[PDB]
C-alpha cells in the first residue's frame, strides 16, 4: 500500500543516518548534533570521526549525559554493519529522553568515504 | 528477549515487502519480467558510465510527476543507489510511494550487485 | 522521532536481529538456549559452516524438518551475507511455525572476518 510504504520509509529515515548526510553536517559545522563514539575508550583514542565525543556503550547513563544538551540530536556509531553498538546505544539515549539517531555503517563506512581524526 | 512468534512473523514479512535483494532482482530481469521498473537514483553521469541491466535513469532529487508520468503504476518500482552507506534508494522510495507507486528499495545498491554478476 | 518512539524502535529491532559478536559469545559459552540454523544449500553447509550449526535449507523449512527442534530454544538463522534474503525469509517461516526466531545479520561473510568456522 503506497501510504504504508511512505510512512515506513519516512520513519526509517528518521531513525538512521548515512555517511554522506553526517559528513555534510560536520563540514558545515552544525551545532544541532552531537556525534558520539560508542566504541571502547582505546579505540576512540587511536582514531575517531572528527568532532565526535567518547562515551562507551555500556557506560551510557545520566552521569555521562548530564553535560549533553537535549536540544541537540545525538548521533551514535560503532565499528561497522556487523556491530550492534550504535543501535543498542541509540536505545539508551532515547530512553534518557534524547533525540537519538544511529549512524548506519560506523567507522568502516566512514573511512571509505572520509578521513579519520 | 527476542520477539514473539506472531510479532516476529509480521515484522519479517513486512520487511520483505519493502526491500529486495540482488538474487531476486537478478532472476526477474534475466527472465525479463515486465512487472517491474528498475530505477537508478544516482546522478546521470554515474548511470551513463554503468548501471544495472534494463534500469532507467531518474536522479533522486528529480523524482516528480513530470518524470514519472510515463511510468506505469501497474508495475512495481525498484530503486537503488550506490551501496549500504547511501540513502538514495530509501529517500527515492519515499517519493515514489508518495506519488502512488508500488515502490520497493534494493538493499545493497550497485556495490552488492557488482559482487554478484562478477 | 520522539525519545519514546525511538526507544521502542531500537529495542524491537534488537529483538529481531542479532550480530556476530553476540552470537559468537553464545556459542563459545556453549549456550543451550539457542539453535543456529544454516539456511544455505546442503552442499554449502557440508563444505563449511558456523560451529554447532544445523543444516535446514530455506525452501525446505516445514513441520517435518522442525519437529525435532525444541520450541523452548531460540532459532538463529543465517545465510551467505548482506546481499542474501535467506536469513530473513527463513526467519519468517520459523516464526510462522511458532518458533522464537532471530536472524543473524551478516551471515557467513561477516562471521568469517571475525571467527573461524568448522
UniProtKB/TrEMBL annotation, chain B:
<protein>
    <submittedName>
        <fullName>BH2092 protein</fullName>
    </submittedName>
</protein>
<feature type="domain" description="Rhodanese">
    <location>
        <begin position="32"/>
        <end position="118"/>
    </location>
</feature>
<feature type="disulfide bond">
    <location>
        <begin position="81"/>
        <end position="86"/>
    </location>
</feature>
Amino acid at each position: 500500500n503506497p501510504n504504508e510504504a511512505y510512512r515506513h520509509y519516512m520513519k526509517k529515515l528518521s531513525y538512521e543516518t548515512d555517511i554522506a548526510d553526517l559528513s555534510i553536517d560536520i563540514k558545515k559545522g552544525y551545532e544541532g548534533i552531537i556525534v558520539v563514539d560508542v566504541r571502547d575508550a582505546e579505540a576512540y583514542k587511536e582514531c575517531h570521526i572528527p568532532t565526535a565525543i567518547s562515551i562507551p556503550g555500556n557506560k551510557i547513563n545520566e552521569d555521562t549525559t548530564k553535560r549533553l544538551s537535549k536540544e541537540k540530536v545525538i548521533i551514535t556509531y560503532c565499528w561497522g554493519p556487523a556491530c550492534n553498538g550504535a543501535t543498542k546505544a541509540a536505545a539508551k539515549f532515547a530512553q534518557l529522553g534524547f533525540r537519538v539517531k544511529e549512524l548506519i555503517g560506523g567507522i568502516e563506512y566512514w573511512r571509505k568515504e572520509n578521513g579519520l581524526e
